[PDB]
Symmetry: C3
Subunit: 494 residues, 3 copies
C-alpha cells in the first residue's frame, strides 16, 4: 500500500502549497518570484561561490591525500561496472539538457552581453569561452563527486541507508531520526524534484522552439503540456515492466548517439579551429581558475552573475542528491581517489570538449561576420542550437537528431530520479511496490507545467535558486561530516 515517514505528507503539502500559490495567484506570482529570487541571489551569491569553491578544493584534497587510499565497500570489493561503460552511464543520467540548451546560447550570450567590461571582439570571445568553461567544468562535477563520495562511503562502508538523512551519522549520532534529519530529507526531495522540473521545462522549451523553427508549427499555449504528459507517460512506461529501459542500455545508446552527434559537429565544422580553441580555452580556464572561480561582480554590480553563475551553482547543487545517490549505488568498489578523479576530471573534460565543439564553432561563425546567431539569441535563447545547425550540412537531419538527443536526455534522468525520490521518501530500496514512482514523475510533470504557465525561464530559475539556498549549508555540513567519517574509517583500519 502506502509507506510513509513524516517526510512524505508535508512534502506533498509543500508541493501543493506552491501549486495553489502558482494557480490561485496567477498574476501575483509573476512579480513575487523574480523579486524573491533576485533578493536571495543578491544576498547569498558570495555564499554560493564560497560553497562551490570549498567543495571543489575539498574534492582535490580528498583525492590527492592519504584519504584517497580508501576503497568503497571495503578492500575486498570489486568495481563490477566496467569503467568505460561506467563513465557513459554516469554521464547519461547525470547530465541534460545542460549541454543542449546552454551549449550555444551561453557562449553567444556571454559574447554579446559580457560579464565584465572588455575591449575587443577576440577578448570577448575568450572571456565567453572561459566563463562557459567555469560554468561547465571542474566546479560543476566537484559537487557531484562530493555527494557521490559521501553517499557511497556512508552507504557501503557504514551499512546505513543511502539517504541524506543518514549521512550525518558521525556528526550527530542516532538522533537524526527524530525530526532533525527529516528537514534534511525534505530539502533533498524538494531539491531533486525542483531540479528535475527545471530540466523538464528547459527540455520542453527547447523542443517546442525546435518544432516551431523546423516545420513552422504554432505550439505555444496548450500542447506543450501534452508533450510533458506524453514524455512522463513514456518515462513511466520505461519505469514499468516489460523491459528495463532507461537504466543500462538506453543510457549507453544515448551516450553513443550523443558522441556521434558531437563528432559530426566536430568534423563538419571548423575542426582545426575547434581543436586549437579547445587547447587554448582549456589552458586559459586552468590559468585564470582562481580569478574567475571567486569572482563576485562586487565593484561593477551589473547583476550578470545573478542569472547565470549563481543560478548555475544553485542548479548543480539542487541536482546533487539525485546524481550523488545514483553514482553512490553505482560505484561499489572504486578507490576514493579513483572515484573523485573519474567523476571530476574525465566528465569535466568531456563537458569542456562539448562546450568547445559547439560554442567555439558558434563563436568562429560570429567572428567570421555572420551575426544572425546574435540576433537569434537576442530574440529567444531557446532557438540557438537550431540556428547554429541552420548553417550546417544536413540541417533537418541534425535538428531531428538533436531533438531525439534531448528526448533521451530528459527521459533518462526522470526515470533515474523517480527511484531516487522514492528511496528518499520511503526509507527502503525494494519497497514500495511500483506505483509511487509514477506519482512522482507525474508530480515532476505537474510542477514543470505549472511553473512554465506561471512564468517563463525565470520561474524555473527562481524555484531552483530558492531550494538550493539551504543546500549550501547542507553541503558544507556534509563535507565536514565526510571528513570526520573518513578520519574515523582511516583510524579504524590498521
Amino acid at each position: 500500500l502506502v509507506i510513509n515517514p513524516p517526510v512524505f505528507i508535508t512534502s506533498i503539502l509543500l508541493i501543493v502549497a506552491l501549486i495553489l500559490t502558482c494557480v490561485l495567484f496567477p498574476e501575483k506570482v509573476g512579480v513575487w518570484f523574480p523579486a524573491a529570487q533576485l533578493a536571495v541571489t543578491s544576498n547569498f551569491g558570495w555564499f554560493f561561490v564560497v560553497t562551490v569553491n570549498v567543495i571543489l578544493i575539498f574534492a582535490i584534497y580528498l583525492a590527492f591525500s592519504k584519504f584517497g587510499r580508501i576503497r568503497l565497500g571495503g578492500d575486498d570489493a570489486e568495481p563490477e561496472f566496467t569503467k568505460a561503460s561506467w563513465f557513459a552511464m554516469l554521464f547519461s543520467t547525470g547530465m541534460g539538457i545542460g549541454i543542449m540548451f546552454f551549449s550555444i546560447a551561453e557562449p553567444v550570450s556571454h559574447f554579446f552581453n559580457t560579464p565584465r567590461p572588455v575591449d575587443t571582439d577576440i577578448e570577448a570571445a575568450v572571456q565567453a569561452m572561459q566563463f562557459t568553461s567555469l560554468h561547465w567544468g571542474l566546479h560543476a562535477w566537484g559537487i557531484y563527486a562530493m555527494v557521490g563520495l559521501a553517499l557511497a562511503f556512508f552507504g557501503f562502508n557504514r551499512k546505513l541507508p543511502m539517504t541524506f538523512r543518514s549521512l550525518f551519522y558521525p556528526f550527530w549520532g542516532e538522533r537524526i531520526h527524530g525530526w532533525w534529519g527529516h528537514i534534511i530529507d525534505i530539502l533533498s526531495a524538494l531539491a531533486t524534484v525542483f531540479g528535475l522540473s527545471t530540466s523538464l521545462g528547459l527540455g520542453v522549451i527547447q523542443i517546442t522552439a525546435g518544432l516551431e523553427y523546423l516545420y513552422g508549427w504554432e505550439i505555444s499555449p496548450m500542447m506543450q503540456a501534452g508533450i510533458i504528459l506524453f514524455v512522463i507517460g513514456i518515462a513511466t512506461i520505461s519505469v514499468f515492466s516489460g523491459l528495463d529501459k532507461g537504466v543500462k542500455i538506453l543510457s549507453n545508446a544515448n551516450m553513443y548517439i550523443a558522441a556521434s552527434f558531437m563528432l559530426l559537429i566536430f568534423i563538419l565544422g571548423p575542426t582545426l579551429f575547434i581543436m586549437k580553441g579547445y587547447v587554448e580555452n582549456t589552458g586559459a580556464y586552468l590559468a585564470n581558475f582562481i580569478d574567475i572561480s571567486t569572482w563576485n561582480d562586487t565593484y561593477l554590480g551589473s547583476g550578470w552573475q545573478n542569472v547565470w553563475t549563481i543560478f548555475y551553482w544553485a542548479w548543480w547543487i539542487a541536482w546533487s542528491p539525485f546524481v550523488g545517490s545514483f553514482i553512490a549505488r553505482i560505484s561499489k568498489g572504486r578507490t576514493v581517489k579513483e572515484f573523485v578523479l573519474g567523476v571530476l576530471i574525465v566528465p569535466g573534460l568531456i563537458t569542456l570538449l562539448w562546450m568547445n565543439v559547439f560554442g567555439g564553432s558558434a563563436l568562429h561563425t560570429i567572428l567570421s561576420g555572420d551575426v544572425t546567431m546574435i540576433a537569434a539569441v537576442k530574440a529567444d535563447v531557446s532557438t540557438a542550437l537550431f540556428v547554429f545547425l541552420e548553417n550546417f550540412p544536413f540541417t533537418k537531419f541534425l535538428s531531428i537528431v538533436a531533438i531525439i538527443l534531448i528526448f533521451s536526455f530528459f527521459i533518462t534522468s526522470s526515470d533515474s530520479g523517480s527511484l531516487v525520490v522514492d528511496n528518499i521518501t520511503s526509507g527502503s530500496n525494494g519497497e514500495s511496490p511500483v506505483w509511487q514512482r509514477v506519482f512522482w514523475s507525474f508530480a515532476q510533470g505537474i510542477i514543470a507545467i505549472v511553473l512554465l504557465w506561471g512564468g517563463g525561464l525565470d520561474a524555473l530559475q527562481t524555484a531552483v535558486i530558492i531550494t538550493g539556498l539551504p543546500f549550501a549549508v547542507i553541503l558544507l555540513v556534509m563535507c565536514y561530516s565526510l571528513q570526520k567519517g573518513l578520519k574515523e574509517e582511516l583510524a579504524k583500519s590498521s
Copy 2:
C-alpha cells in the same frame, strides 16, 4: 650592579651616535636621510623582494613536507596556551599598529596614485585592494613564521638561549661568542629598537591627528612629546610589579575590542559589499600572487615601490626578532606544520579581513562618488581613518574607540619589545633586575622624538630601511641554517 656583554655598549654607542647625528646639523640631516634611503631601496628592492619571496616559499615548503612532523620541545611536549587564546596573544604583540594607520590610507593611496597604469576606476580599486592584500597578507606573516620557527626550534629542541647569536649554531661552531656573532645581536637589537621606534612614530603621527580632527586642537610640536612620555610611563608601569598588565589580560581584551570595532564597521557599513569584496579580493590576490609578489617596477621606474612595498618588507624584516622571539617564547609544544599554518594562514586571513572591512568600504564610498577621502589622503595620510569614520554613525564614539585601540595596540608591543631587547642584550631570561627595561623604553621614546622632529613619516622610513637592509642576508643565512638544523634533527629520530 649591571650586566655587560659588549653588545650593550657598542649598541648604545650606535644609538647615541645617531642621536648626535640628528640633534646636531638639524636641517642638514633632512638631505642625508631620504637620499640614502632612496639609494638603498632603489639598489636593493629586488633583493628585498627575493628575500621575502624565498622566506614565504620556504615556509610553504616547511609546512607541507616531512619537516613538519617535528614538534617543538620534543615529542612528549604538550602545548599550554589554549589555542584560541594563542591566536589572539600572538596577534596583540604582533600585528599592529599597521592596521589602524594603513588600513584606509594605503588602499585610497593605491587608488588615486596607482602603482601601474590602469584604464578605469573599478580596475584601479581592484589593483589597490590586491596590492593591499600583497602588503598585509602571506608575505607579511611568512617572515614572522620563519623567525618564530627558527627561534623556537633552536631554543627548545637544542636547549639554547633564544637569541639571534645562537640561531646560527649549525652553520658555525662555538665561534658565535667570539665577536663574529656579536654583530648579529647588534643588528637584532637595532632592528627591534628601530622598528618599534618607527611603529611608535606612526602611532603618534596618528592619534593626535584624530585629536586635531575631532576637537580642533593645536598640539605640535612640544606637547607631542608629552604623549610619548606618558605612554612610555604607562608602559613601564606595566613592566613594573603589583599587576602584570600588558602581558595576558591586555593582550586579550584588546583583541576583543579590536574584533568588536571590526564587527561594528562591518555591520554599520556596506556588509554585502564587504563580504563579496572580501571573497573576490582574496581570490584575486591568490590568483595574481606570483605576478604581484615578484613585481619590481623595473620598466616604468616610477619609484612607487620605494615608499610602499620595499618599506613594508624592510618593516616586517626589521620587526622579525621582536615578534619572532616572543612567539618562540609562546609556542612550546606546537607541531611545526601546525605552527606555520596557525601563524601564517589564520593571522594572514584575519589581517586580510580587516583590510577588506576597512579598505573595501572606503573604496565603496569613493566609487559611490564621495571623494572627500581622496582629498583628505592628499592632504595628509594621518587622518584617513577619522575622515572615514566621519560619515559613520556614532562618529565621536568610534573615533575615541579607535584612539584607545591604537594606544593599547602599541602599549602592548612596547612592553613585549622591552622584553625582547632585555632578553637579547642580556643572554639570560631573569637577569637583569628591572632597571634597563625603563631605560630601553625611554631610549625607544627618545629615538621616537629624535626621528619625529627630524622628519615625519619619511625619517622613520629611512631608519627602518637602512636598518633592515642587512637583515635580508641575516634572514637568508637563518633560513639555510634552519634547513640544516631540521635535517640534522629529523635524522636523529631513532
Copy 3:
C-alpha cells in the same frame, strides 16, 4: 669495414633523395618548402603544444612522486661527476646556437612584432620577455630531461643499448628488431642530423653577418661553403686521435668563456635594470605559465606562432635524440628526481638568466629611445647581437669574443653529434671505427650547404619542422613507455 643495418643505407638514400630534390629544380623546392612547412605547422601546432606541455608536466610529476626515488644504474652506481662538471658539459654540448642567435633577435622581434595585441609599450616589452622566457625556459629543457632520463634508465637499469629502438622495450618487447624500430631509428637519425644542420646554418649566417658588420667584407656563397668546410674540418681533426677535444676540456672552457661574456655584458650594461627585470620577468613567466604555454593563437590566426613557437618546439624536439643520448651517457648514478631537477630547473634558470641579461638590456636600450636595433632586426635578424654590441664599450673585442663563442658552440655540438649519429646508425657503442664519424660530419655540413643555398632561414625551419612532426607521437609513446618501465622497475624492489 662497414656496420650495416638497413637503417644506415636507407637513411643515406633519404638524405641523398633530399639532396636530389634540392639541387635539382631549385625554384620548385624554393616555392614548395615554405608552403609545406606552413601547412604542417598550421595543421599541427596544437599537437606540438600538447606534446611539449604533456612532456613538461610529466617531468614535474615524475620528479615529484614516488618514481623519483629510483636511481639510474642501480642503487650502488656512484655517479662519478662533480655536479658542476655534469652541468657544464651538459650545457655546452646540449645547447646552441640560439643562445647566441636569438638572445637579442627574438625579444626585439616580439617587441615590435607582437604575438598578440597590446596597448602600451611597457606591456609589449613585458610580453616579449615572457614569450622569450616561454621559448627558452622549462618547456625547452623538459624534453631534454625526458629523453635523457628514458635513455639513461633503459640503457643502465635494463642493460640495453642506448638507442631509440630499445627505448620502446616494454611496449613491444622483442618486436623492435624487425623493421618496426627501424623506422624510429630513421626518424631519430634524421631528426638529430637535420637539427644539427639547422644549428650549423644559424651559426654560419650569424658568423657571416658579424664579419660583414665588423670588417665591412663581402661574402660569397662559396666563401660560406669554405667556412662550413673549415669548421667541419676542425671537428674531424678533433675526432682523430693524438689529442681529444674536449672531451670535457673544450666544453668546460667554452662554458667558462660564455659565463665571462655574460658577466661582462651584465656588469658593463644596466646591471640594476637587468637584475630587477630578471626577477620580474621570471615571476611573470611563472605566473602566466599556463596561459602562454597553451596559447594556440586560434582566434587571431595571425601566424606569429608559425615561424616562432612551433619552429621552436620542433627544434627542441628534433635535437632530442642528440641531447638525450648525450646526457644519458653523461650521468650514470643520478637520482631520477635529482636528474630531472638538474636538467630542468638549473639549465632552464641559467638560460633564462642569459635571456634576461641580453634581451632586457636590449629592451632597456630600445625603451630609452635608441631604436636602431629595431631597424637592424627589420633589416636582418642575424646582425642583432653585433648591433647591440656596437652601442657597448669594447665593441670589437666583444664581437670577436662572441664569434669565438659561436665557433666553440657549433664545433662542440657537431663533435658530440657525429658520435650520436654513428651510435644510432650502427646499433653498437663505438667500434665503428672512425671512418664514418668524419663522413657523418661531412654529410651534416653538406646538408647545411644545400639548405642554405636553396633558401634562407625558411628552408632550415622547414626541414626541422618536417622531421619534428612524427617525433610528437614518438615522444608521446616514449613517455608512456617510460611510465610503464618505471612502474615495472619500482615494483621489482623486493
